[PDB]
A paper describes a structure:
Biochemical analysis and five crystal structures of OTU DUBs with or without Ub substrates reveal four mechanisms of linkage specificity. Mechanistic and structural studies of three closely related, unstudied OTUs with distinct cleavage profiles revealed four mechanisms for achieving linkage specificity, namely (1) the use of additional Ub-binding domains (UBDs), (2) specific recognition of a ubiquitinated sequence, (3) the use of a conserved S1’ Ub-binding site on the OTU domain itself, and (4) the use of an S2 site enabling DUBs to bind longer chains in a linkage-specific manner.
In contrast, and to our surprise, OTUD2 displayed a marked specificity for the peptide that was derived from the Lys11 sequence of Ub (K11 peptide). Unfortunately, the close packing of a symmetry-related molecule most likely affects the position of the peptide, and residues that affect K11 peptide hydrolysis (Phe4, Val5, and Leu15) are disordered in the structure. The peptide does not form significant contacts with the protein, which would have been expected from the peptide assay, suggesting that crystal lattice formation affects peptide binding. The Ub in the OTUD2 K11 peptide structure is located at a similar position in the S1 site of the enzyme in comparison to structures of OTUDs with Ub-based suicide inhibitors (Huang et al., 2012; Messick et al., 2008). The K11 peptide structure revealed how the isopeptide bond is bound by OTU domains and how the proximal Ub is contacted to form an S1’ substrate-binding site on OTUD DUBs. Nonetheless, this revealed another mechanism of OTU DUB linkage specificity whereby OTUD2 selected the sequence context of a ubiquitinated substrate, in this case recognizing the Ub sequence surrounding Lys11.
Residue numbers in the entry:
A (entry chain F): 7 to 13
B (entry chain B), D (entry chain A): 146 to 309
C (entry chain C): 1 to 76
E (entry chain E): 1 to 74
The structure:
C-alpha cells in the first residue's frame, strides 16, 4: 500500500 | 483455480470510478481520476437526452448530470453501462452481498472483460496476480475466459460461507 | 440584496449579493469574509447543492433566503 | 511556557473518531472506540432525516448511516458537528492546508473546548504539555481560553512549513 | 504607525494606527474595516489579552508586527 491507509 | 486478488481503493464515495479506472488502465491506482470520469458521464448523459431520460435516471437529465458530478454521490448501474461502452469492454461485477456476477456489455461482443467486486456499497478492482513479482498483475481478460469468472465468484461464495 | 449562510460550525454569515451573482462569486465572497477556500465549500439550497456556473436567480434564491454551508473536512 | 503538541494516532481511516475521543476523554488513546462512535453517528443521522437530507448527505439517510458505520470511511464536518453536541464541547479543527480554524459548537455556549489538527488527509489530537514532571498533558480547555487558539494557529503555520 | 492582524480565519490584515490609539478604538476600527462588534472580539499580543482602557504604547507594539484577533461570538 502507498497512500495508503490500512486497518 | 486460486481466487482473484482484490486491490483496495478508498471508500471516498468514488470507489466505482477508481475501480473501473484501475482495471481498464491495466492496474493504475489513481483516485484523482474521479472528477473527470464523473464529468465524462455527465457529458454522455447530457449528450443524448432522449436516451438518458428521467425514466432510467430516476430524476431529470440536468438534475442527474449535476448530481453525478458531486464528489460525494455514488455511481451505479447507469455509470457502469456507460463506462462499459466507453472503454469497450465487458464489466463484470462480483456482488458479495447477493452472491452473483452482474455482467455489463455481455450482448455487445466486446473482446475484453474486466472484473470488480462489490459489497452493496463499496467497489474494489479485482486482478489476477503472478508469482514473478516483476510480472505485473493482469486486470484485463479475454471475454472467453471462463476461469476468471470462477476465480472471482469464489470470493463471493467464500464471503457467504463466512456469514454462516 | 441580503442572504444568509447557516454553517455546520454554528454561526450565520450575512452576505450582500445581487441575483445576477454567480455561485462562484458567492463562494468568493465567503473566502473574502471568512477565509474559507471555495473548493472546501458546499452550498445547499432548497434541497440542491448549488453549482458554480449558475446564478442566484437560476436557483430562485431571493432576499432573506438562507443558504446552508458544509465544509469538506474529511480525514482519517 | 507550556507547548501545544500533536500526538500521532494511527492512520487507519478512523483517525477523526480516535482523535475526538482522545481529546474529550482527557487524553486517552483507544482505537477500538471508532466502531461505537460511528454507530452513535448513524443513530443521530437516522433520527433527523429532515436535516440530514439527501442534498446534505449526497445519498439516502439510510445509505449514509450504513456508509459511516464502515471501518474504512472518513469522518468529516457532519460527524464533527454531531460529536460536538453529543460531548457538549467546542471542537476546533485546525486546518494546516491554508492555516485556519473551523470551530464546531461556535455559538452553543459550551464551557469546554478541544483541538484537532488536520492536514486534509489525517486527523490527530492536540494537547498542552507541561515542563513539570508531575503535570500531565491537558486536552480540554476553557471556552474563555482564546490563547490556545492562537498557539494552535502558529502550530498550524509551523506544521505547514515542516510538511513542505 | 501601521500594523498587522491575523484572524483565526486565515487572513492577514493591515491597519492604520498611532501609539495613543486605545485598544477600544483599535477594537472599533475593526468594525470599520470588517464590521465585527467590540464585545465579540479579543486582541492578543506576546501571549497577552488586551483590556479596553489600556493603550498600544504600554503594550509595546509599534511596527513590523503581527497580531491576533479572536471572536467571543454571541
Ligand atoms: Mg448469461
Amino acid at each position: 500500500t502507498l497512500t495508503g491507509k490500512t486497518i | 483455480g486460486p481466487v482473484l486478488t482484490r486491490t483496495v481503493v478508498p471508500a471516498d464515495n468514488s470507489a466505482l470510478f477508481t475501480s473501473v479506472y484501475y482495471v481498464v488502465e491495466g492496474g493504475v491506482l489513481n483516485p484523482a481520476c474521479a472528477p473527470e470520469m464523473r464529468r465524462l458521464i455527465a457529458q454522455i448523459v447530457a449528450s443524448d437526452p432522449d436516451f438518458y431520460s428521467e425514466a432510467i435516471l430516476g430524476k431529470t437529465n440536468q438534475e442527474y448530470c449535476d448530481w453525478i458530478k458531486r464528489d460525494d454521490t455514488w455511481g451505479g448501474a447507469i455509470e457502469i453501462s456507460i463506462l462499459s461502452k466507453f472503454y469497450q469492454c465487458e464489466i463484470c461485477v462480483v456482488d458479495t452481498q447477493t452472491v452473483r456476477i452482474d455482467r455489463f456489455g455481455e450482448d455487445a461482443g466486446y473482446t475484453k472483460r474486466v472484473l470488480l467486486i462489490y459489497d452493496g456499497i463499496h467497489y474494489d478492482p479485482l486482478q489476477r496476480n503472478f508469482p514473478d513479482p516483476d510480472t505485473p498483475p493482469l486486470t484485463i481478460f479475454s471475454s472467453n475466459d471462463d476461469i476468471v469468472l470462477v476465480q472471482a465468484l469464489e470470493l463471493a461464495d467464500e464471503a457467504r460461507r463466512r456469514r454462516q | 440584496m441580503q442572504i444568509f449562510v447557516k454553517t455546520l460550525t454554528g454561526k450565520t454569515i450575512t452576505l450582500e449579493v445581487e441575483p445576477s451573482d454567480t455561485i462562484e462569486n458567492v463562494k468568493a465572497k465567503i473566502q473574502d469574509k471568512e477565509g474559507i477556500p471555495p473548493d472546501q465549500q458546499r452550498l445547499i439550497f432548497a434541497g440542491k447543492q448549488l453549482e458554480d456556473g449558475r446564478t442566484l436567480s437560476d436557483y430562485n434564491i431571493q432576499k432573506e433566503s438562507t443558504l446552508h454551508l458544509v465544509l469538506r473536512l474529511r480525514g482519517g
